[PDB]
Structures are given as structure tokens and as C-alpha cells.
Amino acid sequence: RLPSADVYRFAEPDSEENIIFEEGIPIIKAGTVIKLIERLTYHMYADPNFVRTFLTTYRSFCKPQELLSLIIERFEIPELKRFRKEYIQPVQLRVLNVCRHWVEHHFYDFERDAYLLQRMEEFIGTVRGKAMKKWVESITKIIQRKKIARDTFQSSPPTVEWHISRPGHIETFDLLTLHPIEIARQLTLLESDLYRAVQPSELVGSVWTKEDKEINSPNLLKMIRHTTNLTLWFEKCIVETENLEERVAVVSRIIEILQVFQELNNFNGVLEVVSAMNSSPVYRLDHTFEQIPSRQKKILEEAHELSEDHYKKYLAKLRSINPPCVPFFGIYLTNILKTEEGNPEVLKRHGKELINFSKRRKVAEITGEIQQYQNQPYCLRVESDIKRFFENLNPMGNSMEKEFTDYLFNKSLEIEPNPKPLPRFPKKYSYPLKSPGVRPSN
Numbered sequence: 001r002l003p004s005a006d007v008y009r010f011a012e013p014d015s016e017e018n019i020i021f022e023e024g025i026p027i028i029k030a031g032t033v034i035k036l037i038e039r040l041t042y043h044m045y046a047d048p049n050f051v052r053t054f055l056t057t058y059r060s061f062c063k064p065q066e067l068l069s070l071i072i073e074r075f076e077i078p079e080l081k082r083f084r085k086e087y088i089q090p091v092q093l094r095v096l097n098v099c100r101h102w103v104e105h106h107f108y109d110f111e112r113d114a115y116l117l118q119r120m121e122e123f124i125g126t127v128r129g130k131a132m133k134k135w136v137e138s139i140t141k142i143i144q145r146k147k148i149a150r151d152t153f154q155s156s157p158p159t160v161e162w163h164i165s166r167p168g169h170i171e172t173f174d175l176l177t178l179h180p181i182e183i184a185r186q187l188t189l190l191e192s193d194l195y196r197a198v199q200p201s202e203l204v205g206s207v208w209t210k211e212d213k214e215i216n217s218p219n220l221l222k223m224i225r226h227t228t229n230l231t232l233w234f235e236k237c238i239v240e241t242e243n244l245e246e247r248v249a250v251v252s253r254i255i256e257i258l259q260v261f262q263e264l265n266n267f268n269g270v271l272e273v274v275s276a277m278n279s280s281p282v283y284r285l286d287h288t289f290e291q292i293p294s295r296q297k298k299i300l301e302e303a304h305e306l307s308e309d310h311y312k313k314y315l316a317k318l319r320s321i322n323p324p325c326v327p328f329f330g331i332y333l334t335n336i337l338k339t340e341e342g343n344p345e346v347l348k349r350h351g352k353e354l355i356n357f358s359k360r361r362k363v364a365e366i367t368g369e370i371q372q373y374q375n376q377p378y379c380l381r382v383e384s385d386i387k388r389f390f391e392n393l394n395p396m397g398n399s400m401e402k403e404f405t406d407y408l409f410n411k412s413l414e415i416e417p418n419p420k421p422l423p424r425f426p427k428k429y430s431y432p433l434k435s436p437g438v439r440p441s442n
């Protein structure tokens with residue numbers, strides 16, 4: 001029935017040397033690249049979970065150019081009445097379905113590689129056939145829509161809040177001059193847009209830590225860099241305020257921003273404040289935290305407790321709230337890296353190497369959890385000048401990260417030296433330190 005090895009590479013029988021399954025549509029555990037492509041375009045049934053997971057994770061084991069060459073060759077299949085009807089036509093329609101999902105959900109590969117797109121359009125444009133016309137036409141319209149695209153409140157959003165800095169006075173914008181409510185809202189819109197922009201393939205096979213990270217993971221990198229710039233800027237605001245009374249005002253203002261992040265269910269923001277508060281230069285400031293009111297200390301402790309016991313309280317709090325929210329991104333990076341490190345790239349059976357597909361699938365299920373929260377818009381107005389201020393945060397300046405964190409700790413040792421005495425430092429703020437609070441204006 002199926003073709004011989006001398007004419008087709010996709011029709012060798014299944015064995016423990018080329019394809020292994022998990023414990024109805026079977027679920028592939030590991031297999032050769034040829035075996036994966038074959039099951040990806042299996043003539044017996046439709047497999048949307050495998051199609052979706054394969055196109056998200058394939059870059060970890062196959063190059064885009066190689067995948068196109070293999071699916072084109074899988075399509076080219078050389079009793080002839082039933083051979084075309086039950087084997088050639090179903091496989092060719094499965095190949096076209098794979099091209100459709102590929103161009104629709106992963107167009108960035110055709111954007112990054114112009115020659116890849118040239119080959120894909122050449123392949124689709126040469127198909128012809130009877131039932132393939134409708135397939136060639138939907139695929140063509142998707143490539144058209146993607147090429148063109150590359151080239152709203154449900155209710156009244158609250159009034160934008162201002163404090164010392166008047167609107168448009170961008171040169172005075174700072175932690176204590178902007179309104180703490182507006183800082184949290186504007187940072188939540190910025191973080192919400194960053195969260196929503198991340199694609200699942202940016203998180204596969206640790207590509208964001210490899211040589212071509214800027215191309216493969218630009219949205220993920222933007223998200224981690226925002227977290228680093230915000231957390232380090234909060235710490236810099238704290239240790240660079242040498243006067244103790246003014247430093248209490250600064251730390252206390254950051255706690256107020258975290259409370260507005262909690263009202264907004266921006267967990268990403270909450271844990272960036274907790275991260276700055278737990279950092280080595282800030283966490284050891286006993287004289288500063290002694291002055292922080294009890295209610296405010298309790299708010300910071302309950303925020304920390306979300307992380308405790310492998311984020312037990314965070315995971316329970318996240319699944320109980322209603323939209324909108326901004327989930328804590330770091331836990332996904334943590335669980336994905338644990339998966340990448342604790343599972344082997346390949347499985348060996350009978351001296352043969354099989355790609356570990358279950359490893360990729362476990363990583364793809366974590367990215368699916370990410371995606372379930374990417375359609376939650378906030379009923380908040382953007383303030384372009386405040387958004388720009390946070391987008392342009394550069395606490396590190398022209399320094400390496402380690403050199404700047406070393407400086408932050410040394411500043412902490414300077415402002416709060418035991419048994420060395422506690423020096424008094426002059427005031428740096430020439431405006432009122434009192435917060436306008438976190439209650440909106442009705």
C-alpha cells in the first residue's frame with residue numbers, strides 16, 4: 001500500500017527506533033524529524049493540538065527552511081484510484097492546513113526570512129488540483145493580510161490624576177512629583193501591552209539567552225528589560241535618597257504604588273515592588289523600615305507571602321480574580337527554564353536519537369497559560385508623557401548591571417552603615433513629601 005524507501009522517506013513503518021508515544025488520538029513523546037513531519041500531516045485524522053504545538057516549538061529542533069523543504073517533499077507523493085483518494089489527497093490537505101496555521105500564527109518567520117516567503121508562495125502558487133483551490137485561496141488571503149498589516153472604552157475611564165508635576169511639565173516628573181495612582185495605572189497599561197505582545201516561540205528552547213535573541217525574542221526581551229529597569233529604578237530612588245526622613249517618604253510612596261497595582265490586579269507590578277524591597281541594598285535598611293507605618297508594612301508582607309511555598313497564594317489569588325489583570329511574568333520564565341534544564345533534548349532508543357517532543361509540549365503548555373490572559377484590556381486612559389517617562393527609565397546609565405548593583409549596595413552601606421554610627425544627611429527634595437494618598441477623586 002504505502003510507498004517504498006527508495007521513493008518516499010515518509011512511509012517507513014513505526015518502531016521503537018524512530019517514533020515513541022505516550023499512554024483516540026495518540027500523543028507523540030519523541031521521534032525522528034521525518035517521523036514528526038509525517039504524523040504532523042497524518043492522513044488518518046486531523047490533529048490540531050499537534051499542529052499548534054509543533055509550529056510553536058519546532059524552531060528548537062528544525063530550522064524554518066528545513067521545515068518547508070520537508071513539508072513540500074511530504075506533499076510530493078509519487079489501485080491508483082484509491083491511492084490518490086485515501087492517501088495522497090488527505091496528506092496533501094494536511095500539508096496545506098499546516099501552511100495555513102504557519103502563515104496565520106507564525107508569520108514572523110516569513111518576515112524575518114524573505115527567501116522563506118518566496119519559497120512558500122512559489123509552492124502554494126504551483127499546487128493547482130481540484131479541492132486544493134479553496135486551500136490555496138485561504139492561504140493566499142492570509143499572506144496578503146499579513147503583508148498589508150506589516151506595511152475604545154467599555155465604560156468611562158477615570159480622570160487622570162496629577163500631584164506636584166502639572167500636565168506637560170515633563171522635566172519635573174519623578175517618583176514623588178507624579179501622582180502615585182497615575183504611576184501605577186500608567187505602569188499597568190505599559191506592562192499590560194508588554195505582556196500581551198509576547199509570542200510563545202520567544203519562550204522555547206531558551207532562545208532569549210542565545211546569540212540571535214534580539215530577533216527571536218524581541219517582545220520577551222522588552223518585558224524582562226522593563227522589569228529590570230523598573231525594579232532597579234525603585235532601588236536607586238531609595239538608596240540615593242540619603243536623608244532618612246525623605247527615604248521613608250520614598251519607600252512609603254513605592255508601597256502606595258504597589259497598593260494601586262493590587263487594586264488593578266497587576267501582579268507583575270506587585271512583584272517588581274516586592275523584588276525591589278527584598279533586594280540586598282533595600283532589604284537591609286532597618287532604620288527606614290522602622291518608620292514605615294504598620295499597615296503599610298503589612299501590605300508589603302502580604303505581597304511577599306504571594307511568592308511563598310512556590311507561589312501558592314499568588315496562583316490561588318490569580319485564578320480567583322476577574323479581568324483585567326497583568327499576571328506575574330517571572331514565574332513562567334522560572335518554570336520554563338526548569339523544564340528546559342530537567343528534560344533531555346533527545347531520547348536514545350536502539351542507538352538512534354529521537355527528538356524529545358514531550359519536552360517541547362510541556363514548554364508549550366506553559367506558554368498556553370501565558371496566552372489565556374493576553375486579552376484583558378484595562379479601562380484606563382494613556383497619558384503619553386507619563387508612559388514615555390517609564391518607557392525611557394535607564395537607572396543603570398552607561399554601567400554594567402553588576403557594577404550598578406555593586407554601587408547600589410555600597411550606597412546602602414553609606415546611608416545606613418553596625419556597630420558603625422548612623423550619619424545624618426541633608427535633604428535633596430525641595431518640595432512637599434506628603435503623599436496625596438491612593439483614593440481617586442470621585
Ligand SMILES: O=S1(=O)NC(Cc2cccc(C(F)(F)F)c2)=Nc2ccccc21
Nearest residue numbers: 277278283289292297298300301304305
Ligand atoms: O517579612 S516578609 O514576609 N516580607 C518581605 C517584604 C519586605 C521587604 C522589606 C521590608 C518589609 C517590611 F515589612 F519591613 F516593610 C517587607 N520580605 C521578606 C523576605 C524574606 C522573609 C520574609 C519576608
